[PDB]
Design a protein around this ligand. Sequence first.
Ligand SMILES: CC(=O)N[C@H]1[C@@H](OP(=O)(O)OP(=O)(O)OC[C@H]2O[C@@H](n3ccc(=O)[nH]c3=O)[C@H](O)[C@@H]2O)O[C@H](CO)[C@H](O)[C@H]1O
Ligand SMILES: CC(=O)N[C@H]1[C@@H](OP(=O)(O)OP(=O)(O)OC[C@H]2O[C@@H](n3ccc(=O)[nH]c3=O)[C@H](O)[C@@H]2O)O[C@H](CO)[C@H](O)[C@H]1O
Lengths: 475, 469
Amino acid sequence: INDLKLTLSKAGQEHLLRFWNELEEAQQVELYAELQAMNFEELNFFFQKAIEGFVDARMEPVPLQAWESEGLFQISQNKVAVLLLAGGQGTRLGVAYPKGMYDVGLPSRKTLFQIQAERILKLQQVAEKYYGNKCIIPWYIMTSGRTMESTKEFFTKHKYFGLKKENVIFFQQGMLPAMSFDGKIILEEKNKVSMAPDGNGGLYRTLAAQNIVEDMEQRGIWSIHVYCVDNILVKVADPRFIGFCIQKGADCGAKVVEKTNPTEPVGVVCRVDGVYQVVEYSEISLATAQKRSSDGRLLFNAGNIANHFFTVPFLRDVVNVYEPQLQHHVAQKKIPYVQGQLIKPDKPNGIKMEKFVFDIFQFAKKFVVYEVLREDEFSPLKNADSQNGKDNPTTARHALMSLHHCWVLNAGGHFIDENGSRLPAIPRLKDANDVPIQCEISPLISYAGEGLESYVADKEFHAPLIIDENGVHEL
Amino acid sequence: NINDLKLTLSKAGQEHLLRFWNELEEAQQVELYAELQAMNFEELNFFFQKAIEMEPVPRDQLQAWESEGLFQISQNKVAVLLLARLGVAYPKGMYDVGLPSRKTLFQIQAERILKLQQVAEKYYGNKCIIPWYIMTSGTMESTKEFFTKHKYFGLKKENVIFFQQGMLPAMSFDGKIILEEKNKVSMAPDGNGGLYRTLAAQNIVEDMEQRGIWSIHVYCVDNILVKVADPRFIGFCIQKGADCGAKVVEKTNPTEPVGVVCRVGVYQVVEYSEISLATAQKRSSDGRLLFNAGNIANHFFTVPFLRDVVNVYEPQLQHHVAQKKIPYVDTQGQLIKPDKPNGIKMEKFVFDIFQFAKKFVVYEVLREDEFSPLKNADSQNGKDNPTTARHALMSLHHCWVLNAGGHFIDENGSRLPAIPRLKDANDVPIQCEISPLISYAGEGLESYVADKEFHAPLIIDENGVHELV
Ligand SMILES: CC(=O)N[C@H]1[C@@H](OP(=O)(O)OP(=O)(O)OC[C@H]2O[C@@H](n3ccc(=O)[nH]c3=O)[C@H](O)[C@@H]2O)O[C@H](CO)[C@H](O)[C@H]1O
Ligand SMILES: CC(=O)N[C@H]1[C@@H](OP(=O)(O)OP(=O)(O)OC[C@H]2O[C@@H](n3ccc(=O)[nH]c3=O)[C@H](O)[C@@H]2O)O[C@H](CO)[C@H](O)[C@H]1O
């Protein structure tokens, strides 16, 4: 401990040992492990530059077959990977397990992870169909908190959903200590430093420290599709988006949906002082949020759907060179703490340092924006049911089923009531007993509405209707 | 009831099984009746009619393999499956070879399992479990009794899974089922290859899947040196991506009774009793035996492979036959111990599944560290007996002490050679025994022995180091 004491004294963090004599050896060793693992010199520096750092006026608006084929070709060449921002405990949904494990009550009861996995396997199959060889889209999954072990167990239980273990790469995001307004690391307990994830922009520090870009390079990957786990409609490894970005020579790309409600909680892609960035929804004034352009659309209408494209060379530069130049954002927090007694604070007593995944768009030499349709591509799981009526399991399950219902109609199929009366595209729900059409199509059958003609063309179905690898089921 | 059974028996040419029915007490009749009704005589005849009717294996990372095996164990992804002449009627697991500790083979195995759980916890930081599947035969109740009395040697009841393999009737050379007693069919276990059928029948692979098991280490009960759930073997098999693996030692004596791993363009073991002397003696240009990969009855199976075995491969396994001297009751009602073999037992062999492996690997180990089987009673042929078994274990642990920096001394305090000369017929080899709870394979001995010296017998256990006096 005299080497540790010295390290702590040099950094001005020697209060971290103040309960040492009150701990049993079991507990002392876990503190020791925690402290020995930290870079106190670096942390003081991060704090100092974060505090030094501690918008609307400078914001300005953002003014196909070949794409899909290009994307499928890149997939077929083993040149595409995906990187999943898997998040931490699903505390915003009222659960401790990560969001990828959430079951929104689809007819199949499939989790978000399973749907995403089946989308990946599907594209591998489609590419093999068009270009003739077996191909691989590796799946890099960044977990946070300490959800990694349970995520691995979940995947193993499900046999990686038909993917191969060797092509799913789990890695866990680092944590930073909470700091007081004086820059002192806060003990949560006598034997425990208070620690927290450093935001999804902690991705970059984590890729660097764990040599993840080097694995992509070894595999020969060129394009990375970064996406958020919470969106049930997400077009994982979307070949149209990948082809778009490849043909534009993008180093970085972002998908957006049209924001139509001023107070929708989406970051807006815009230019600030000439450069591309996402301005977070909690940063803009209501005046900026509500500004309309002459067509009547919102001026800032490019809503960030957390779906990005990076080339591997750009990611390498971000990880090795750029992100280290960015200072952390300060967020004040109520941090539970221990002289002698365990206290829960009624007001913020400390700072969490964080970065966001979109903070490095500013470094892109060729940034591009790809607009998509909300109903086909963006239905996020953000909230518990009944919290605010939006972005919850009910809206998520209904968005997917609505989408699949539309696929069936567009492929020439029809839904009928119990008398064989064909239902409208938009049915009237008038009695307490009426429910929307329940339709669920596995990604193994259809990625984006293609390939349904043998299943549904010129046929009538009574919902609920499930289409999957075992056929067509009317429940 | 009886006139119907008789017709069933008559159709199968087995009606002699009722020979003594007119002399049996009522309760005796009920028991024989229940035995016979459960048998499928058509199938048995079919088994009997079929049953009665090579290329060499082309020949450091040890720590990396061990670490991977420990990681599998730490994730609860490893289980072991125990396959369970000495002149005793009780199962071999209960045999006491006369170690200083007097521990039975079962106890030594149990403590190896407990040890690895602890070692994997030390390595990776979480508590973990290695389920122990124990395949018995119709040994089952005695084995369970024994374990319960010893409180599972410190393991949890719920992680020791006893299951009973099938039995087959002994049959004459003419395919007639043999009566052991006037009201009892002579039954024997169907070979250690009976594992696969039993797995399918009792949904054991479902159980492995439910538990989250990925790798099974299958091993023979009789080897006092057996590295139960050996993390090196498991790790090797994991890194090679094998579905199936077999541990071997180098066979150097042509007539050693070990099966030999070979290719027959697929992997097999050819049992020692099926090889010609010519094949057994053949030597390659380096002077080693051409067929030198001796099967030590230690196998690796992935659970997906066992799933494929249960789903697809298990039905194609063949019965081996062996001529046996089967105790019987003659046509005069006399109990006879036959002067000449009088029938056959049909048996499957556990290694016959290797022909279905797509990624089969062989892992060579050192005999002195890993293989000292208990096959024979002490006087019978000078080999593979309680004496050799006990001395092999004590020699190993002696080597562990020296390798860890300790020394043995004589009664005057003088250092003994690694290989001392025996002085007279009353002299003894160094006696040393180290509990598996202290050391699984020679690790963790520094604090006990490094730069210390010991007068044998030396025991090291959870109560420390003991010079016996
Ligand atoms: C910083 C960020 O990403 N902002 C994006 C976000 O905002 P939004 O503020 O809604 O993001 P969340 O609140 O969904 O995510 C922030 C981070 O919080 C963590 N977390 C969140 C919920 C939870 O139950 N557990 C948990 O650990 C995750 O690490 C996650 O990556 O998604 C939207 C699209 O839907 C926006 O348009 C984006 O600008
Ligand atoms: C078929 C077999 O494995 N042969 C092996 C065997 O022969 P070996 O002829 O000496 O012995 P066995 O076939 O009896 O097999 C030994 C193991 O199988 C178990 N058992 C046996 C019969 C049964 O119906 N059920 C059952 O579980 C025994 O309890 C024991 O644990 O061990 C040697 C190594 O020492 C050989 O190199 C092997 O080729």
